[PDB]
Design a protein around this ligand. Structure first.
Ligand SMILES: *[C@](O)(C(=O)N1CCC1)[C@H](CN1CCCCC1=O)NC(=O)[C@@H]1[C@@H]2[C@H](CN1C(=O)[C@@H](NC(=O)C(F)(F)F)C(C)(C)C)C2(C)C
Ligand SMILES: *[C@](O)(C(=O)N1CCC1)[C@H](CN1CCCCC1=O)NC(=O)[C@@H]1[C@@H]2[C@H](CN1C(=O)[C@@H](NC(=O)C(F)(F)F)C(C)(C)C)C2(C)C
Ligand SMILES: [Cl-]
Lengths: 306, 306
């Protein structure tokens, strides 16, 4: 037993990271097949980044302006194009360590692993959720741009995030691997604000199930509720609405524990109204909303990723 | 910026995990060079595990009783010996993916990454601390025995933990890679108790520095204290004594932030006496003691692990 914030194993992604340099800007790229993908602001000086014209910077560049390194090997670039906010560099060598992979655009409330990299080299791995306001709460220093977010599905890496920037509040914003931002952000160094955040209700319920599985059961009550009556109460605490889709997704936890979803909702309703009454759940004094139902099943049933 | 519980990248370890089977007991092993290391209770039936005689079980086994698989390949075992609570299996094939490595015995208060595995296959990665009572708070289901804990130092994996069991309180116990337990536990299915835990003071101070680096500064006060006077107060809250060694180790954080260690101790003293006054630090309502000073520098300066 036990419950921990767990990242996917990172090996399959570690063998795809390279260092991309253009002029004196250096960041990370992801080498899959004969293509390297990286943030397009690799073509900016830091002054350009205050107000960039990427198309105009890119025309002035040729293949030879891009230095791509994988450990000791330089990779000769033989083509380039821009897709939204991502730069695609065609190279003369396919990556032999390319895993089976897909590009995916994730939904608010879904989690992924981040492999934080500096100079093409992996530094660490952690879990993030895509917030309802389309930001993530990560850990990224200078050089971390181009670090990617991902999920593993057996042998297949789904890439879902590439890191670009940090907002004035300290949270993080990036793109899918087709270079489309999550949320209304642009790759320019100017003040921009995220929407106010909300709590991912389905994820709090999945954590309450994890808690029960792990023996923490003091918050369980004898009541049920209706979806409608739960959403009316929760709304005021800035919880996002729970839909019937979410109820269906929680069904496996429900069946594993023998506690109906609307029985758990009745427990959560009382926690929001009354507080935690000087008690913890899974060691935490606050409700946690960054585990998906899948994360809980994965961890509290034992699913692995060849 | 940002601060997250971060694991080392797991690739170097992922290529060392194999599945070991003996009879109808299956668990994980670590394949380095031509040796596989695994928990010795792989030779037990579940009935044996209630009260095992490992030496007597092992004499009855020969090399051919051990089935070791790496993905599709079976590895023929050509020798076996027991070292404390670990079983060493000599195999006919050296692991070509063996990283530079060392075996290390860690101290209470030190952190490591755990690669949780099932059937030789990696499931996930997380950070743990070795508690002062020599347990860890992990996440381990049936099949997870033989999962290892580790640190990376540039290119070198230091292996420090191999998972064996879970205690009646839900916390976890294991051995170093020479098969010596951390703490007074034995590999037998019988009631055993950990010492009462204590809080790792140096780690709470390193987290307070992380917090300051990340802009959370409300708990900073204008006072200093003496090491002696801090330890007198903290003792009563079941904080472990802060030594001059610990002060020296915190020096880098101190210099990065310009806040003397005994200035921070004066802040921590007031937090213990007065409480957190309905405020959080780095998002947490409780003090966190599972980041080492090194973890903080690593994450809030950007160190990577080729
Ligand atoms: C990223 O550019 C990078 O790693 N490198 C460029 C060469 C190496 C860098 C990553 N990073 C470092 C600063 C702390 C957090 C972080 O994500 N990203 C950036 O510096 C982007 C980049 C410029 C400005 N920028 C920002 O993140 C900035 N934010 C903003 O201006 C705002 F949107 F949030 F308001 C600063 C945090 C630097 C102020 C691009 C947006 C193109
Ligand atoms: C480990 O044996 C394993 O993964 N496998 C055996 C074949 C696959 C297993 C891992 N595990 C599964 C149960 C939940 C937590 C956990 O660590 N470890 C064990 O089952 C050990 C093993 C027996 C008994 N054991 C225990 O962990 C037990 N604990 C105790 O008896 C006590 F020390 F804590 F009191 C139980 C949790 C199973 C009660 C060995 C000690 C040899
Ligand atoms: Cl908390």
């Amino acid at each position: 037993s036990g419950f921990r914030k767990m990242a996917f194993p990172s090996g399959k992604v570690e063998g795809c990271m390279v260092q991309v340099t253009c002029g004196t800007t250096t960041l990370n790229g992801l080498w899959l097949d004969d293509v390297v993908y990286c943030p397009r602001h690799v073509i900016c000086t830091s002054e350009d980044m205050l107000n960039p014209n990427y198309e105009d910077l890119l025309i002035r560049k040729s293949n030879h302006n891009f230095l791509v390194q994988a450990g000791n090997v330089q990779l000769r670039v033989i083509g380039h194009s821009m897709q939204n906010c991502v730069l695609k560099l065609k190279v003369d060598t396919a990556n032999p360590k390319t895993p089976k992979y897909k590009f995916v655009r994730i939904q608010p409330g879904q989690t992924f692993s981040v492999l934080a990299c500096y100079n093409g080299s992996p530094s660490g791995v952690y879990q993030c959720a895509m917030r309802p306001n389309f930001t993530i709460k990560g850990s990224f220093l200078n050089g971390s741009c181009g670090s990617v977010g991902f999920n593993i599905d057996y042998d297949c890496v789904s890439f879902c995030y590439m890191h670009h920037m940090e907002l004035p509040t300290g949270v993080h914003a990036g793109t899918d691997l087709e270079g489309n931002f999550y949320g209304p952000f642009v790759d320019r160094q100017t003040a921009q604000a995220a929407g106010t955040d909300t709590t991912i209700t389905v994820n709090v319920l999945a954590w309450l199930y994890a808690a029960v599985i792990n023996g923490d059961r003091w918050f369980l009550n004898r009541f049920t509720t209706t979806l409608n009556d739960f959403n009316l109460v929760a709304m005021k605490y800035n919880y996002e609405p729970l839909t019937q889709d979410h109820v269906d997704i929680l069904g496996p936890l429900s069946a594993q524990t023998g506690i109906a979803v609307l029985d758990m909702c009745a427990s959560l309703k009382e926690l929001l109204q009354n507080g935690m009454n000087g008690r913890t759940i899974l060691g935490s004094a606050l409700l946690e909303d960054e585990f998906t139902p899948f994360d809980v099943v994965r961890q509290c049933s034992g699913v692995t990723f060849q």
